[PDB]
Enzyme design. Structure first.
Site, short mmCIF file in Angstrom:
data_model
loop_
_atom_site.label_atom_id
_atom_site.label_comp_id
_atom_site.label_asym_id
_atom_site.label_seq_id
_atom_site.Cartn_x
_atom_site.Cartn_y
_atom_site.Cartn_z
N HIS A 45 133.16 -23.22 7.97
CA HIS A 45 131.96 -22.74 7.35
C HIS A 45 131.74 -21.26 7.62
O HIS A 45 131.10 -20.58 6.83
CB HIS A 45 130.75 -23.61 7.71
CG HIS A 45 130.13 -23.32 9.03
ND1 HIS A 45 130.36 -24.10 10.15
CD2 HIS A 45 129.26 -22.35 9.42
CE1 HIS A 45 129.68 -23.61 11.17
NE2 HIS A 45 128.97 -22.56 10.75
N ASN A 61 129.97 -6.68 25.09
CA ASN A 61 128.68 -6.20 24.59
C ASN A 61 128.89 -5.75 23.16
O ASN A 61 129.64 -4.81 22.93
CB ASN A 61 128.12 -5.09 25.48
CG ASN A 61 126.69 -4.70 25.15
OD1 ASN A 61 126.30 -4.62 23.99
ND2 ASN A 61 125.91 -4.39 26.18
N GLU A 69 138.10 -3.54 24.10
CA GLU A 69 138.15 -4.18 22.80
C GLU A 69 139.45 -3.84 22.06
O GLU A 69 139.90 -2.72 22.14
CB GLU A 69 137.00 -3.72 21.91
CG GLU A 69 135.58 -3.96 22.46
CD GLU A 69 135.00 -2.78 23.25
OE1 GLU A 69 135.77 -2.02 23.89
OE2 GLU A 69 133.76 -2.58 23.21
N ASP A 93 135.53 -29.22 9.88
CA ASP A 93 134.98 -27.85 9.99
C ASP A 93 135.85 -27.02 10.92
O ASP A 93 135.51 -26.74 12.07
CB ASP A 93 133.51 -27.85 10.42
CG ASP A 93 132.82 -26.53 10.22
OD1 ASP A 93 131.64 -26.41 10.70
OD2 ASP A 93 133.42 -25.63 9.64
N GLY A 186 125.27 -17.93 14.82
CA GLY A 186 126.08 -16.87 15.36
C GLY A 186 127.02 -17.35 16.43
O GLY A 186 127.94 -16.61 16.80
N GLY A 189 131.82 -21.55 15.26
CA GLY A 189 133.21 -21.20 15.30
C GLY A 189 133.76 -20.94 16.67
O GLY A 189 134.99 -20.96 16.87
NA NA Z 1 131.66 -3.69 22.90
#
Ligand code: NA
Length: 240
Positions: A45, A61, A69, A93, A186, A189
């Site tokens: 979804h 964050n 990241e 799903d 949010g 998944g």
């Molecule tokens: Na970040």
């Protein structure tokens, strides 16, 4: 995640943020689990919309540079062929995303370990949900990755009339339902991590909560049961 606590930044290194292009910027929409250096597992979804998606690994964050990241485009989306977007309760799903590049592994970026096929958790098994989802019903996304302790609720209980009834299937895991802690929008998944024989494994992919709210007593968060889909996942990766 409602009723969570901030995670330590190296606790859940398989957690990813799935983001979509929103003008000149990117926005978090869903969670996921890194399962190969170039594959992510998420909910079907989450990818129903015809958006431009990227994956962020090593994220902590969403609103600050963490210095850890890696950002990678999504090259191919493989949704479970039985998924039906207007019947989330039917199950299936789950989706796999092939990344444009292979990410580099480190203490912030690791593959999620999956359970053995067929594994079902005993009632009240210790698990954590993780994610950046809303921190209250009808609230706002977390800035920092959150975790909440959600013990499992077995099928016999979860499928009883005061819980979810027929809506929950054996291909799902339920966890929580205490009225304080839960998944929320949010978080979809993303992983449900459960400690089995000393090792956390990803047993669930967050799928749905109640329309009456996220943290509702006797409406535990519902996850796709990863252990029902081991052959499917292997088949997809081996054919892509
Ligand atoms: Na970040």
């Amino acid at each position: 995640v409602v009723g969570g606590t901030e995670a330590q930044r190296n606790s859940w290194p398989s957690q990813i943020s799935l983001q979509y292009r929103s003008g000149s910027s990117w926005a978090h929409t869903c969670g996921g689990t890194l399962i190969r250096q170039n594959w992510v597992m998420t909910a079907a979804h989450c990818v129903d919309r015809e958006l431009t998606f990227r994956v962020v690994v090593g994220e902590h964050n969403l609103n600050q540079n963490n210095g850890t990241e890696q950002y990678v485009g999504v090259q191919k989306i493989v949704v479970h062929p039985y998924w039906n977007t207007d019947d989330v309760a039917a199950g299936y799903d789950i989706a796999l995303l092939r990344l444009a590049q292979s990410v580099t592994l480190n203490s912030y970026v690791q593959l999620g370990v999956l359970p053995r096929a067929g594994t079902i958790l005993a009632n009240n098994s210790p698990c954590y949900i993780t994610g950046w989802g809303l921190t209250r019903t009808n609230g706002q996304l977390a800035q920092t990755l959150q975790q909440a302790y959600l013990p499992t609720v077995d099928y016999a209980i979860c499928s009883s009339s005061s819980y979810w009834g027929s809506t929950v299937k054996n291909s799902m895991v339920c966890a929580g339902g205490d009225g304080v802690r839960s998944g929320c929008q949010g978080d979809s998944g993303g992983p449900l991590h459960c400690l089995v024989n000393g090792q956390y494994a990803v047993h669930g992919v967050t799928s749905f909560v109640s329309r009456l709210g996220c943290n509702v007593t006797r409406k535990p968060t519902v996850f796709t049961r990863v252990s029902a889909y081991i052959s499917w996942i292997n088949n997809v990766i081996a054919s892509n």
